[PDB]
Amino acid sequence: RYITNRLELLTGEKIIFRSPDKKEAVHLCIYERNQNTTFHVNNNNGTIFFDLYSFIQKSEKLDSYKLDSISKNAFSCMGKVLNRGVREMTFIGDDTTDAKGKADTFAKVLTTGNYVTVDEDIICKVIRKDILENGFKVVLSCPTLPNDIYKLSFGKDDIDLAQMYKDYNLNIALDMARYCIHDACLCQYLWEYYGVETKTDAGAATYVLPQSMVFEYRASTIIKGPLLKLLLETKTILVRSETKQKFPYEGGKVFAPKQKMFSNNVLIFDYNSLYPNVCIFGNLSPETLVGVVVSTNRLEEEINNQLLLQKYPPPRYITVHCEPRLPNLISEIAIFDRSIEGTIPRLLRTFLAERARYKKMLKQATSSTEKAIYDSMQYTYKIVANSVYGLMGFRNSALYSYASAKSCTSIGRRMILYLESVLNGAELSNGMLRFANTLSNPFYMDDRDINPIVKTSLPIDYRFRFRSVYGDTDSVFTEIDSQDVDKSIEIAKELERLINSRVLFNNFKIEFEAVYKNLIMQSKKKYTTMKYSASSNSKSVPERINKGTSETRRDVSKFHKNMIKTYKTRLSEMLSEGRMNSNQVCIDILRSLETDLRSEFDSELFMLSAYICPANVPSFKLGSNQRIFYEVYFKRLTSEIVNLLDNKVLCISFFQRMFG
Amino acid sequence: NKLDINECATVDELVDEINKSGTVKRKIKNQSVFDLSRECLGYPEADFITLVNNMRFKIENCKVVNFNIENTNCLNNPSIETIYGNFNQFVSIFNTVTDVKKRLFE
Amino acid sequence: MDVRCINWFESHGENRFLYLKSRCRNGETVFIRFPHYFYYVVTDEIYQSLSPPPFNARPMGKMRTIDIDETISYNLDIKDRKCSVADMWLIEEPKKRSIQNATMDEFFNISWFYISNGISPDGCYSLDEQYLTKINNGCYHCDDPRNCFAKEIPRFDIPRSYLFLDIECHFDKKFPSVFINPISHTSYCYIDLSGKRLLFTL
16 A cells, blocks of 8 residues: 555556556555454455465464564574673574474575574574574574573564654665565565465365455355265255344353362363354254244143153154243254254365365375465364354354254363263272263263273273362363373373273364363453373473463553562462472462562552552553552452462462551 | 133033134134133233243143142242132143143144 | 456446456566456345346346344244255346345455455466457457356466665754655666666665
8 A cells, every 4th residue: 555655646656457458557546344343455467465464363363473582482482592791691492492394494484584583582682693404503682591492483573664764874785685684584484384376276175265355255156065065965955935133142161179288289171172063963044944943831842842752752863952042931942853964064074084184185195285285274174164053043044043053162161061071080999980970961861881880991900089070061080080190191192092982972083182281261261371291191391382472562551560470489389299388389480479579669661451549558551650550460460370379378468468 | 711712511511602703713723722721811921931930841742740849939020929829720720721722723 | 368467446437347467478568458346145036027137137046045144042042044045147247236125235346356256365377268359569458258268277487577765865953844845866776687686775
């Protein structure tokens, strides 16, 4: 926009696009597709005018969409110091020093880099570059540090541009050339990092559509391709001769854990695509729905209720209790006929089927050009599958079916409660694992070996019991209370062996991811420590730093905090042990916080994502009136993190201490 | 009384009188045993529901055999207790109309 | 001649066209221009009883139509939906006609092109070379997409071009404006068909 507008302004000439046959001419003029808008270019000569900003806004769920942060966490590698010095150090980056390859990528972007980050927060200008045969040598203007291994994250670029524009001379011109060219080259290192050039093709084969539509539209517009191809094999047409009515409803329940840490490392069992599996099991569809029956009052329910069992019997029929539509009656049993394939079940079956195949042909590929084609294909199918539940609810889609949508979340959330219920399972005496109580199957009797007692592979005899769990729509956090040491893993393997294989009925299945260590669940699944140590425990190095990254926006004052880091790190390091640092956690954190607060109530950072108060109890700027907000945030730091400890005594005790 | 017909001392006499009366049959057909057996007793329209929704029941063959109210607050309303005391009559006429509606479109 | 497809696009003048931009084995690039039709789906009855006769139409087979409207039932007497069955016709025309009782509407004129024609927007096709008439240098017109895109070959590698850019502008207030501020710097990463990456700044 700048370029073309300035051009018009100064010389009155325009940017022109011909057709391939030279019989149409257009001028550049950006337009929009308001959906969080998105700007597009109006060209008609075949070029694809991409823009990464929109693409990573769509396909990635990150906390900041500033070039700095993405270039930060995408391009990174661990480096090793060879000689320290004064006000400058020397790093090397290679093979096994960290994982295969990222050394090479780091060396690639370093070719035009200027400022790096030393393992966190420490920006330094680059002094010397050296492209190794396999890695990189770099020399940085950073102060000397204790350790020998460090993180190396590529970019914050703390530069003051306005000032440089005030005192323009030749030198800063030659500097800013080096900055703008590096920006442009980053805008290509990213496009190679995401492999957009092969997603743009996988999305044109599956999502039958041109190559320049693939990232411009919403889900409702891209599913019609495979859907049409399905309708054409099954000789089917669905016609809605009615005008739909909207009965807004729950989007979903938020699950909230009540402890993190002393729990003694939780497992991390995962669901493999619940909603598509449910839409297959129950055979939900807009045309396998026999009917919904309702009742405005009791004594009509129980009539209808013993009726619809005498007719409509399982397993040929499945019936679901939903949340009442018109706030007035109280029934809404919906009935589905599980005898011929619905349309949505066919769709989902093919999607899961082919993703499961390309998952393999990738494992068998050897060249480096295929391992991109297959990986892009499986990603494509993953997306298309996970986009079908939320689209049944959209009133304006083509998969719209109110009852089917409400019956999802219903079967699903029964499934969730049925898993989390039977999970207590204090295993011992060579295999106890009662789970919760019974291994029944909801929705009907399946006659499938309900024996709460069960014998495992049983490496040895054990006395490890499981604690009631917290779970989610996607995951299940089973917190082992025994806390082996790191071998407890052999316990999750065999647990996967059974729960998602014997305590389960149909296509519902196994995952077993792993997020060990004593996390700190400060909030929804979105905010906690990362501490991730995957199933390869052999000689482990975990990801320690952060999962929340709600530590990026201020919108507040910036004087008297900064401790949030230190409080967080103290609380983390205190739980290295698991038994006896619970009371020590509360005691030390609250005592030290009181001491700090009092010391500088009577005598840089505020991130956690004008009205003035006095401080006489025992356009927003600061003054020498600091004694205001000492009082609030310190109360907060402990009132927020409550889902980690259980010493509910000293918590409100210090709460009362600071009351006066 | 409610269906503009002759007195019928027994139930099959009733079903006959209905069956020969095409209009009475055809004006039963559209209805529910509940709405009809409450219109034959004049409960107003609604508070009947605040009653019904306060008890549990016992049904077989789509036919009440038992019931019991569990929240007693509603009876403190005047228009409510007049309906409550007058209930067993409604239960009985309900079973009867169930039976005739079964045997008629039988 | 064996091409790999790069991108398809449309043209919304008075006249409609679909363009295929493609690269051959050696790297020389070709444009192919098909006409663009509005499609519809009709029942047999509507097919013959319709006037004027359409431009083209070919039978889809014998399909089952289903009504799927959701209706709250009260008693228990659940009824069954109207699953009619008939023979379907797929009807193409160059202009926009409104036809009563034409089902299968929810789809774009672009999917009807790829499906009804056996074309996949990723294919590597050996074009049948007699159907493509000159228009201009690198611009051939086709009329029978079926026979032209009849073949297929395994995928083969091609070269591609790029351009990655960025600018920086003079500014002194909050954040600049085109009426007051000149462009200080302008950079460019130019990767050519021959495959040499050139950087420069102005």
